Each structure stands twice: as structure tokens, then as C-alpha cells.
Amino acid sequence: PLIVPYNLPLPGGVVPRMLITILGTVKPNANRIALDFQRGNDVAFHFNPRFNENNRRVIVCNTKLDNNWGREERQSVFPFESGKPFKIQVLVEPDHFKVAVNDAHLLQYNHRVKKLNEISKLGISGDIDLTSASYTMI
Ligand SMILES: Cc1ccc(S[C@@H]2O[C@H](CO)[C@H](O)[C@H](n3cc(-c4c(F)c(F)c(N=[N+]=[N-])c(F)c4F)nn3)[C@H]2O)cc1
């Protein structure tokens, strides 16, 4: 298994048609997962499944610029299940990151950070056993 938190370099940043695939298993009593697409210290796209936010499950997405979080985009559709294997696919499209979980579309996140070629790291953190993290062009 891979170490968590995991640092996946994205050489030269991201580009439309780049597909990132994360495979893992959610831990028993998981609390949180995070994917952090980073441009240096900024987080261009934070994808944060929360398993117990006021006793509800929700996905919070946001961007961090100069150490400040912006406006959250929340998705109450929650495809993750504690204890179970998952696949997250993040497809970079021209105007947004497109996320599918277990082969079902989940959400799109419009690019706030526009220098895609500078979004050169993906951090994977939280309450998972991480099996694989990779990218390819489609
Ligand atoms: C005015 C105001 C602004 C923000 C807040 S809350 C803030 O909200 C933003 C999204 O808007 C982010 O979710 C922030 N976050 C999450 C994590 C994180 C982590 F640190 C971990 F270590 C994780 N896993 N492991 N281990 C893991 F999954 C994580 F998500 N880091 N930062 C969160 O603090 C409250 C009030």
C-alpha cells in the first residue's frame, strides 16, 4: 500500500484530457478524505469528503489562495462508504475538473486557478488505505 499522505507530482501541471485515477479503501470509522491539487502553496482544487459534518456526509470543494479559503462548493451526493473500496477519477477539462467516483459522475469544479501548467502536485490525505495514484492522457 502507498503512504498517506501521498504526494503525486504532476509534471508541468495539468492540461485538458489529463485523467488522474486514485484507488483506495475508506477506513472504518473514517472522518475525512482530501485531494489537494496544488499550485505552490495555493490549493487550486481541494476535494474534501467529510463523513461527519454535523452528523451528515458531504463533499466540500474549495480553493486556497495566499493561505485564505474561498467560497465553498458543496455536493450532498456522497458516494463514499466507510470500509469500502473506491475509485476517484479526476478528468481535467478546459473549464473545470470533472470528478467521477466508482464510474459515476459526481461533480465539476470550475477552474479558479487558471495557470493550469502550474498546478503541479496532487496531495492525497485522510482516512484511507491508498492502493494506487496515477495519471494518463485520454
Ligand atoms: C472561515 C472558515 C474557513 C474554513 C473552515 S474549515 C476548512 O475548510 C476548507 C474548505 O473550505 C478545508 O476543508 C480545510 N481543510 C481541511 C483539511 C484536511 C486536513 F488537514 C487533513 F489532514 C485531512 N486528512 N488527514 N489527515 C483532510 F482530509 C483535510 F480535509 N485541511 N484544511 C478546513 O479546515 C472553517 C471556517
Side-chain angles (χ1 to χ4, degrees), residues 32-34 46 48 50 60 62 69 72 125-126:
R32 62 192 173 169
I33 301 170
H46 177 73
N48 176 209
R50 297 182 183 178
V60 180
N62 207 348
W69 287 108
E72 290 179 344
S125 314

Side-chain angles (χ1 to χ4, degrees), residues 26-38:
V26 180
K27 291 184 181 179
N29 329 279
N31 182 64
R32 62 192 173 169
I33 301 170
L35 278 53
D36 287 288
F37 287 90
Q38 299 201 233

Side-chain angles (χ1 to χ4, degrees), residues 113-133:
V113 172
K114 296 179 193 294
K115 291 169 182 173
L116 298 186
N117 69 299
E118 298 187 3
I119 304 169
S120 61
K121 167 188 167 189
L122 171 62
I124 305 150
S125 314
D127 302 327
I128 63 172
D129 296 322
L130 178 64
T131 298
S132 180

Side-chain angles (χ1 to χ4, degrees), residues 55-137:
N55 296 122
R56 305 182 186 190
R57 314 205 198 268
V58 66
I59 311 297
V60 180
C61 297
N62 207 348
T63 293
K64 195 174 72 174
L65 303 174
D66 292 343
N67 250 25
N68 297 307
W69 287 108
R71 146 185 47 95
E72 290 179 344
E73 300 182 24
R74 290 167 165 259
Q75 169 59 290
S76 62
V77 174
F78 196 90
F80 301 95
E81 290 183 298
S82 304
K84 297 199 198 185
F86 63 86
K87 177 172 65 182
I88 302 170
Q89 286 166 321
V90 184
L91 178 58
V92 185
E93 299 195 325
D95 290 326
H96 48 256
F97 291 98
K98 188 173 71 182
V99 180
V101 177
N102 303 336
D103 292 303
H105 177 73
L106 180 61
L107 63 80
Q108 289 172 18
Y109 187 85
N110 190 262
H111 293 309
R112 301 190 194 171
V113 172
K114 296 179 193 294
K115 291 169 182 173
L116 298 186
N117 69 299
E118 298 187 3
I119 304 169
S120 61
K121 167 188 167 189
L122 171 62
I124 305 150
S125 314
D127 302 327
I128 63 172
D129 296 322
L130 178 64
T131 298
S132 180
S134 63
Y135 50 77
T136 192
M137 297 296 180

